[PDB]
A = this chain, B = another copy of it.
Amino acid sequence: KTIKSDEIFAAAQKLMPGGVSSPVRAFKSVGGQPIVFDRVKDAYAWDVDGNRYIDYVGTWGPAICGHAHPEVIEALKVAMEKGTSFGAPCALENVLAEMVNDAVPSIEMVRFVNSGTEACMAVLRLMRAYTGRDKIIKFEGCYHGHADMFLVKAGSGVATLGLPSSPGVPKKTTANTLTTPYNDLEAVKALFAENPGEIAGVILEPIVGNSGFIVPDAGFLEGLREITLEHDALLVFDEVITGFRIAYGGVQEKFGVTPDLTTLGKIIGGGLPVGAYGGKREIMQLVAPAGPMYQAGTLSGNPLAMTAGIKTLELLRQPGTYEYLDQITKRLSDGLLAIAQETGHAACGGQVSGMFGFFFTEGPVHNYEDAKKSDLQKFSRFHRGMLEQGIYLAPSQFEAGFTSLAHTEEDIDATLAAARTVMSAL
């Protein structure tokens, strides 16, 4: 039963567009019956109707240490006694900044913002100001925030319902954005050859999460690194989802490729609204007040967000953190793929650390186009069935799933048991 949710969502539709603060939450691609959360803790989420779920969304990435972690909460209660926002510098900004610099290879200087969208927006402007060029290359199926003159063929909630991008933004403004298929080096080389001295750089999700879970093919990241250097263009990694999840130093640390600039978000805020962008010192020097490129933020670097980020990173620095994530996630992933086979359903997927994907198609999936061959109607029934079995999964075939340090071996087994029950039907 979802009586209270239906009631609250119905009322919500009269107050907010589509009745949500964010598109993907409306469940448009899986039925249209969203459930309203009341509280979350560890690896679970609870309904406004009392239903308990094993959560695989983790508020979309931030809850890697588990929901309402006791130490994060405790640190927040103590900090807010001093005020939630200053509007002036505080020591905690220095602490988190230093922690981020040590953690992320390419980051020598950082700037805190309030969301991944603000960070990506700032990084685009910075790419152009530093190179003096206007064109940017992005990949189909990737999402870097709703940046006006750039938001085109984005993933996330956009691809959730087959939505393209925009409108609003003029066609002239979006002419400075080039697109190519993810994992396609040749397409990228062609774009440079065809636009000599006009590409500021390339921005991408080192590991895709907004058009399903997609890993880069061998030599793809290395390839992009080489071609950008060859044309004095910048290589920008959007690690808003991957940062601190794939590895403490993100994908750039794990796979050994160092970008010039990287954006961070989610986990770095420990649950609160936070974003960040940084990279080579010579580039960050253009950011005001040090440089001419203007970018500001009233609540940027507020003590509460800083406190939550610091505590979250300290927890991740503990022994066996990423080993545990990889272990339970592989068990979850393989298990799902074994069950699909045993029940006769074509499927593929995979995982790296605490991030996984599962598509209802034989694949393999190398790009957004491949991802779109998935049987969306089957995913819809699968999703509803799992929900009824007490498992909460992203309400979209084009969203990667997430695991946390709070998920236990038993939670995993219970999820597999539920998946067998569900797929046996379908």
Residues of A whose CB lies within 8 Å of any CB of B are: 5, 8-9, 11-12, 14-26, 28, 34-41, 45, 48, 57-63, 67-68, 72-73, 76-77, 80-91, 93-94, 97-98, 101, 109-118, 121-122, 124-130, 134, 145-149, 151, 154, 156-158, 161, 163-173, 175-176, 265-266, 269-274, 284-302, 304-305, 308
Contacts and interface: CB of A to CB of B under 8 A. Distances in A.
Given A168-B126, A173-B173, A266-B298, A285 B17 contact: yes
A373 to B, nearest CB: 23
A39 B86 CA distance: 8
Nearest to A200: B168
Contact of A20 (B21, B118, B289): B289
A113 to B, nearest CB: 8
Q: Which of A18, A28, A45, A124 lies at the interface centre, i.e. has the most chain B CB atoms within 10 A of its CB? A: A18
Q: Which of A20, A58, A112 lies at the interface centre, i.e. has the most chain B CB atoms within 10 A of its CB? A: A20
A160 to B, nearest CB: 9
A80 B61 CA distance: 18
Given A25-B89, A37-B88, A91-B36, A146 B294 contact: yes
B118 A115 contact: yes
Contact of A298 (B90, B115, B288): B115
Contact of A21 (B93, B121, B285): B93
B298 A61 contact: yes
A175 B176 CA distance: 14
Contacts of A285: 17
A73 B83 CA distance: 8
Contacts of A151: 294
B297 A88 contact: no
A42 B207 CA distance: 46
Contact of A87 (B58, B101, B265): B58
A273 to B, nearest CB: 4
Given A170-B176, A176-B170, A289-B20, A41 B294 contact: no
Given A97-B15, A173-B172, A297-B117, A63 B85 contact: yes
Contacts of A130: 168
Given A21-B112, A272-B304, 11 more contacts: A12-B94, A23-B295, A35-B88, A41-B83, A63-B85, A68-B84, A115-B115, A115-B273, A146-B295, A147-B148, A269-B299
A97 B416 CA distance: 39
A383 to B, nearest CB: 14
A399 to B, nearest CB: 11
A157 B296 contact: yes
Nearest to A287: B17
Q: Which of A35, A84, A93 lies at the interface centre, i.e. has the most chain B CB atoms within 10 A of its CB? A: A84
Nearest to A164: B292
A151 B296 CA distance: 11
A205 B171 CA distance: 27
Given A115-B297, A169-B125, A11 B94 contact: yes
Contacts of A289: 17-18, 20, 23, 26, 28, 157, 161
A390 to B, nearest CB: 15
Contacts of A109: 14-17
